[PDB]
Design a protein around this ligand. Structure first.
Ligand SMILES: COc1ccc(-c2c(-c3cc(C(C)C)c(O)cc3O)noc2NC(=O)C2CC2)cc1
Length: 207
């Protein structure tokens, strides 16, 4: 297991997300679904010229998996996936510059819900989760698990769990007071409100 420090700007972004009073927490799901859609777009485009990139799985979809027993909400996609290098480099995001652009878009009146416009929507996960695990598999690398409970550090390790084929799984270990996001009707409501026109099948698993 390797432990890394977040860049100062990202730790600041996470501290802001965790500590700022902001009731509209449901946007985290929109942001994660958007990321999955972006990753799915990428493997789709690459497969147009090289269909063998789909040997790791032809289906392009997003699954939402609540587990009330574990208090986890998991978002799984079969997009392009991330390499180990991507994970360490802020999960394939432009997080340093994006955080800068977000930080003082906020000072120009913006609110937290615009976070995705600055490429760092992922970190909105910390509105609802005390810990986030990101398990990912890119065609060119092995399957890795990234994890952080904030506090300035993250870990990366080779994943031992179920083979994913290709794509990304974001596991949200929910805060005690945020269990509404495990309820079927709440999830459906949020998907219909914010993600109605995502161009990939979104399947909400039941328990
Ligand atoms: C908005 O920033 C993003 C969005 C998606 C990704 C991404 C992902 C990916 C990343 C995340 C976050 C953990 C950041 C996610 O929730 C879902 C995903 O499928 N897998 O491969 C990728 N690699 C990519 O190059 C792609 C298409 C965007 C990385 C950065």
């Amino acid at each position: 297991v390797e432990t890394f420090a977040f860049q100062a700007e990202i730790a600041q972004l996470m501290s802001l997300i965790i500590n700022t009073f902001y009731s509209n927490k449901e946007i985290f799901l929109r942001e994660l679904i958007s990321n999955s859609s972006d990753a799915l777009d990428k493997i789709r485009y690459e497969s147009l010229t090289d269909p063998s990139k789909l040997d790791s799985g032809k289906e392009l979809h997003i699954n939402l998996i609540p587990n009330k027993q574990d208090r986890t909400l998991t978002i799984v996609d079969t997009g392009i996936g991330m390499t180990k290098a991507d994970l360490i480099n802020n999960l394939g995001t432009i997080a340093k510059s994006g955080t800068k652009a977000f930080m003082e878009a906020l000072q120009a009146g913006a609110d937290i819900s615009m976070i995705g416009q600055f490429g760092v929507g992922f970190y909105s996960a910390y509105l609802v989760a005390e810990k986030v695990t990101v398990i990912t598999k890119h065609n060119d690398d092995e399957q890795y698990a990234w994890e952080s409970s904030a506090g300035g550090s993250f870990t990366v390790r080779t994943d031992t769990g179920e083979p994913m084929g290709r794509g990304t799984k974001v596991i949200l270990h929910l805060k005690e007071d945020q269990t509404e996001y495990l309820e079927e009707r709440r999830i459906k409501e949020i998907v219909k409100k914010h993600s109605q026109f995502i161009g990939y099948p979104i399947t909400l698993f039941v328990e």
